[PDB]
Symmetry: D3
Subunit: 160 residues, 6 copies
């Protein structure tokens, strides 16, 4: 099975939007969110990846307890969240911890309760509502097969 | 200068929706919110008040640090959030601590930063989205005079 | 589905062993635990039940986020943990929140992942290791049907 | 050997000064402290005591982990903090948990390390500096025997 | 408008005095404070500056929520805290987040409310009372223009 | 008097088992513990050491307040915990902060309360009980002199 390293930027429950600067590796506070919302899962990116824009592929990791900003978590993808915003398409891979039997029951997007997926969607649809010149036009969920394909595309781009 | 006691049910930052049961006085968990949202201010109700809803008049309190559920805070009103939900009008009186000179610069709704009023509005408009058969329609932020009048109304209703 | 109110005494992750006095209703610190352990679920008792020993029926509640000591939670039973300690038979009903569709997938003890049942068991087996004259000696899980029967017996004992 | 119940109003590390209303038993926020200081121990009062000033006798409880506001702790005195402020006399009994063998090495005021006693002193001397028309002009520690004498006086006054 | 990157060493509310080692970039615990006090704002230093003692120029950042130690925050100066301690002169630039319109109402030292500036002064005046070989002699606030002059000097020294 | 730098990987009270990768210096989540236990002291390793295993020598640090993962603490040894798990044998040096006179009363293993030593032992004996292929076979406390020998040992092997 496919797996990889995710670097968590923002723990679950945070209104502080942290981002890891990729030139340096330093954790930065981008902004305090303008909406009364908090990240529904631990949020970050996959190491040694690169998307269409000059940034790694975004990742969401389900956990029994949050980590801190800058922490690595070995994860495997079970699905992916597509969305369109002010800078076009944005993909977010949904993962669980790799080599952990406690998450073996989650092999695909259908194994994650509809209510956690709706809550995730709702966050990304609404979190920038009060920010000038920022919107989220579309949003929906694809399966693990489509997620793994997107990871494979992003690894290939990185190595090039 | 009008003042009253507010009982805080939900501290700022909470996704657990607590409620005081008014007949018994116990704190209950009503529900964990279905949306990835957190109460932007300390939320509760004014003691010895009564609306058309058989319940007390709801209240928001601006604080430097949150209290915990069940705590009493002496407060004075600076405005009111007017909204309609699935059960009609649900007005919420915005307050600051009474007799505290660090809040003397806040006398009316205009003295509260718009960004904070925006975020409070965004919470109540969106926190119930994912709950079926539930919705909110924000009317407007109204001034201190409109608030004090509603508080006075609901105090008279209580005394009966 | 059968349901009832649970008063939570100890939130998940606490080494402080809080207890409610059943006359006064006050929260008391019985003791700081002598072992490096923490309650793996929110822990308390079912309101208006009378067990075989004069005390109410104990309860464990699975939640997405812990509450505080003294909080009421409407819960439905999915199983029961039977064990013996230094004062004989000790039974603890495992529950989920009642009227919450996010827990509809948990209808009996087999739906609760074994890792969580093993952990709960491990807590109670070991938490009084370092207290003299205190132990727990038997332990095993019984299904929803037996839990509901035990709750019903305890509801009646209380009424009489 | 003397012991009693201490009700904790304020946990260690708190800048919010909570208070129990002794008529109703409700927890109130008196005020957010005006200085950048935090209570160095859990703070509260002794149940069934009445001091010379109409209120219950104040108490500091040394703990391995803090409790929450409103929690009872069975405790025994090991000393007292004698203080004169703007309202005159103010005596606070320093306690440890009763019947807990992890505190049996603490028998009198000399057994509490001087760094802790100085820190506590430093709190009460400076926490109201920035509060107007508020001060403390005398601050001294006394032994268990003197502390126990004051508790006894206060207990007997409670029985009027 | 002048701006720079501040690295936060100590979040607001902390009694642990964290310090970044400027050679390696590692975070160190210098000491647990000897007074019962907590840093009243997020505290750190300005990146790519050089104070005339060989360290980066110290910075205080006003935030709606604290960050973690090591986190970068883009900021702009609004004033400066001038103090004289056991090391002689010690300057600390008071800042707000740069490119954040929620802080546009704070442009110079007079825009910060007095109760917050007094609290910050109170911290630095008193936090080393109980520390041996450490004392304060004086503390004053100066305006944005004085602060900017000091930043600019420290920047040129950095380039040398 | 021997002293060294300890990097804390895991703060006290944690169920998340973090690790520093000694190649990269990145913090990684190894695993969420399968037992309902939490690290009773801050846990990590000694910098510039090499144990029998090929990783650095492990360290426990007694603190008045926990740090966060990746923080350096100057520390001196007062004893050592010897254990035999799967993977050979593991040793953990028990320390206190160096140059801190609040810990001067702790010079050898006899000076640490037995209650704290039993709790630390109890953690490392039981924390992997439910993990397959993991175990403990023996657990002992040894004195300062024994610990200092093992540190110096590990320093030499790092240099060689
Ligand atoms: Ca990302
Ligand atoms: Ca992205
Ligand atoms: Ca985006
Ligand atoms: Ca309410
Ligand atoms: Ca209402
Ligand atoms: Ca409503
Ligand atoms: Ca809805
Ligand atoms: Ca119980
Ligand atoms: Ca029982
Ligand atoms: Ca028992
Ligand atoms: Ca035992
Ligand atoms: Ca008191
Ligand atoms: Ca008093
Ligand atoms: Ca007083
Ligand atoms: Ca004063
Ligand atoms: Ca600094
Ligand atoms: Ca300086
Ligand atoms: Ca200094
Ligand atoms: Ca000093
Ligand atoms: Ca280690
Ligand atoms: Ca090792
Ligand atoms: Ca090992």
């Amino acid at each position: 099975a496919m797996q990889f390293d995710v670097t968590i930027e923002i723990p679950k429950g945070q209104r502080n939007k942290y981002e890891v600067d990729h030139e340096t590796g330093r954790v930065r506070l981008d902004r305090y969110l303008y909406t009364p919302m908090a990240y529904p899962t631990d949020y970050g990116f996959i190491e040694d990846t690169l998307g269409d824009d000059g940034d790694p592929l975004d990742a969401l990791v389900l956990l029994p307890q949050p980590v801190f900003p800058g922490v690595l978590v070995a994860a495997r993808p079970v699905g992916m969240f597509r969305m369109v915003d002010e800078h076009g398409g944005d993909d977010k891979v949904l993962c669980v911890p790799a080599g952990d039997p406690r998450w073996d029951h989650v092999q695909d997007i259908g194994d994650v309760p509809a209510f956690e997926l709706d809550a995730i969607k709702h966050f990304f649809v609404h979190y920038k509502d009060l920010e000038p010149g920022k919107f989220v036009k579309a949003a929906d969920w694809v399966d693990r097969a489509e997620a793994e394909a997107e990871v494979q595309r992003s690894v290939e781009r990185f190595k090039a």
